[PDB]
């Protein structure tokens, strides 16, 4: 299911036996309780532009 639309994951997706999918996040992020969204756990997470984020 990861193959189809990133399995709904905001970042990384891992397939499991059956219709079980697990979303994961890059270092410096935590997976939200919705199981798909990633939120920064540090001041400067990768791939984010500060001057724009703060705007």
């Amino acid at each position: 299911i990861c193959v189809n639309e990133n399995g709904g994951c905001e970042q990384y997706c891992s397939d499991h036996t059956g219709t079980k999918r697990s979303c994961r996040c890059h270092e410096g992020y935590s997976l939200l309780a919705d199981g798909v969204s990633c939120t920064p756990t540090v001041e400067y997470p990768c791939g984010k532009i500060p001057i724009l984020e703060k705007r």
Partner: protein
Amino acid sequence: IVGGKVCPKGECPWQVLLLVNGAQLCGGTLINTIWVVSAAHCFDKIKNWRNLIAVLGEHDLSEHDGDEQSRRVAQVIIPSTYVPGTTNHDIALLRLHQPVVLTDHVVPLCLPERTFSERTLAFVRFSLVSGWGQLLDRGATALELMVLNVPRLMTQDCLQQSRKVGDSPNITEYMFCAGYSDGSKDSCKGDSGGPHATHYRGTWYLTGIVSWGQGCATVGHFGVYTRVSQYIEWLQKLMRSEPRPGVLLRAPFP
């Protein structure tokens, strides 16, 4: 960068500038506080490995504003499959002697997982390429970091859409084309090692490395980039290894 625009200061925070004896060599991409991804062919002619410097937070080459951070390159790792003088497997992983300090102007680009990059990122049409390389084919380099948005093509569609020349390097699975064939926009000499960054749901990822092309923005041709997804595992494995004596290190690939 040809036919692009100035990257507003701070909007290309992962962009790296590589210097050799103080002179402009190439660009690179920061992926964490001590690792930089660049292009292997940037080191073909280097003889004095101790004079290789990496500059983060750089924007305007004519002025020091305090956001710049310089680090000596402690190690340059290149895949064993890379052959000097050619363009296949054009990637290099660099270890800084000391970590850079993340700030508003110094931020790493996310190195994506292979699966994510192949079945998701690879399909995002447009991506940003940047550098202080030549503004024109056989032209002068830029004083301010330039950025350009370019569309990615299927190698197949790249092949039968480009003016077939001769002895022109083959487009392999370790590459991909991006840009325009109307001779208006493209990356250029000096931009090599620079990032081809792709956006996906609010975050940017490294999908390419400025690698090569026939001239710059040559009508009927596209810029060619190193397909990073093919090196994710190779990179992750090296970042987990202890440093070794000697700057240049050829590592087995796969």
